[PDB]
Design a protein around this ligand. Structure first.
Ligand SMILES: Nc1nc2c(ncn2[C@@H]2O[C@H](COP(=O)(O)OP(=O)(O)NP(=O)(O)O)[C@@H](O)[C@H]2O)c(=O)[nH]1
Ligand SMILES: Nc1nc2c(ncn2[C@@H]2O[C@H](COP(=O)(O)OP(=O)(O)NP(=O)(O)O)[C@@H](O)[C@H]2O)c(=O)[nH]1
Ligand SMILES: [Mg+2]
Ligand SMILES: [Mg+2]
Lengths: 258, 258
């Protein structure tokens, strides 16, 4: 092979598991030895293209915050709370709307004080529910609001005891835009195990945090690559609410190439 | 192949990086082609002994808490505070000691309010610090206490700035016993780096969190293999102070080989 050695390093520099890494080159060389002619230059673009088609239809990416309720659940320490912040500061100080807050984060000591004083800065309300009875109660209390940002308890979502618990408190229906927050820092094998666990709970988009601490993004590719949905936002720093962006398939696939 | 193919299978299962398996096998295959009888029954013995002889010696592991000042720094959301927390209750409640607290986490919003309303529970003193002088003072104020648990801000240590702010704010002398906090969920490649950026600052042990949340421990081995210090602590849940533990080189390996 020739300009392929060049592309074999690319797929290697990225995360991308083996199954894929190898399968991509298969696809490249096939539709290449028959299609046109590869250059030392156009290898990547052709490379990026093929990859991009392994993800979900680009329409499944960049779904804006539309529905009323905006919930966020995920791994412990990835960016759940600090993100709702970044989002809220947008749905108010930018798209000018009636903003509210609700939290399910009980389990941890003084865990609430955080968002508690996060709202105190956005002059928005806040409710803390320990039972769905209270959560729905909370939904009425904000009825007149455009967007109600929900927060959740950080939990090791492997043990099933916790996906039940989540579906217990929150209802999940018509007016809810769920988001699964994951850190681009997590190992693929890990993420894949929990993603399968949220199979029993609806989810609109992906939120991958800490892309700036990452070293590669292939671990993120593999997750999306084998999923129905794409990614909503992607935090990229601590600074609130600046450090946070949004991306599209090919655009992502473009950060991916190490 | 032979009873060795088995060892070939175990290695696969662990997150161990290729080069290491290749080498563990050359060792295994060597000291068995001119040695004992790798009964597929006692093959798992040497495969661990070999691996074990690759991490720093037992003496570099399990360094108990002695110094008057205990410092924990590390990746974002890894589990520094909950850990600094588990570590404090244990020293107090179980080892009967005069505990004290100190924070440097001025960055994270509400970070203080929580550690304070927690230190209050453990009924212990806490002093916030924005400068090196302030810290040194508190560090000198608590001079009468046995142990002083210092918590730090979770900045992304890829910007040498913060690795400097750390050494600046926190001096580092005989009195201190620092602990680098990394999570068992991170990819090896990410840790491979962030461990170099910390070369300047001295580190006594290592704290790997969320072992109850990861799938394999290969990455944690990979990091240790090419290190000069072992692990002090490991955490396995969110319950304080229960979910915390200690391991030995051979003990850690027994966790890799399932
Ligand atoms: N570099 C970086 N750090 C981030 C990003 N998002 C969150 N962090 C950091 O990760 C840490 C934890 O964030 P936080 O929002 O509290 O996480 P969480 O998911 O709510 N934690 P929990 O599940 O415990 O409630 C903070 O120190 C924060 O600065 C990001 O995009 N980049
Ligand atoms: N499953 C599990 N979760 C853990 C463990 N240690 C910490 N966590 C979780 O990880 C999250 C972050 O913990 P925290 O103490 O805020 O981490 P930190 O390093 O102080 N965060 P920051 O750098 O943002 O200040 C919490 O949701 C906590 O429950 C552990 O051993 N197992
Ligand atoms: Mg949170
Ligand atoms: Mg903390």
């Amino acid at each position: 092979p020739e300009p392929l050695r060049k592309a074999e390093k690319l797929l290697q520099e990225t995360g991308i598991k083996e199954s894929t890494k190898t399968n991509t080159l298969k696809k490249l060389l096939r539709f290449s030895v028959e299609a046109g002619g590869l250059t030392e230059e156009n290898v990547v673009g052709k490379l990026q293209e093929i990859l991009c088609d392994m993800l979900p239809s680009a329409d499944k990416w960049q779904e804006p915050i539309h529905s009323k309720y905006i919930v966020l659940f995920g791994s412990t320490g990835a960016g759940k709370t600090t993100t709702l912040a970044k989002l809220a500061a947008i749905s108010m100080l930018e798209k000018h709307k009636k903003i509210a807050f609700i939290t399910t984060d009980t389990y941890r000591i003084a865990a609430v004080e955080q968002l508690k004083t996060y709202a105190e800065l956005l002059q928005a309300p806040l409710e803390v529910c320990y039972t769905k009875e209270e959560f729905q109660q909370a939904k009425e209390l904000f009825s007149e609001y455009d967007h109600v940002f929900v927060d959740t308890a950080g939990r090791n979502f492997k043990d099933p005891q916790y996906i039940d618990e989540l579906k217990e408190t929150i209802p999940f229906e018509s007016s809810i835009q769920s988001f699964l927050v994951l850190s681009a820092t997590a190992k693929y094998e890990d993420m894949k195990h929990i993603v399968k666990r949220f199979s029993s709970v609806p989810v609109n988009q992906y939120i991958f945090t800490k892309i700036d601490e990452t070293t590669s993004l292939g671990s993120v590719f593999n997750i999306l690559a084998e999923s129905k949905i794409g990614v909503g936002f992607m935090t990229n720093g601590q600074n609130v609410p600046e450090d946070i962006q949004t991306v599209s398939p090919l655009g992502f696939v473009r950060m991916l190439c190490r």
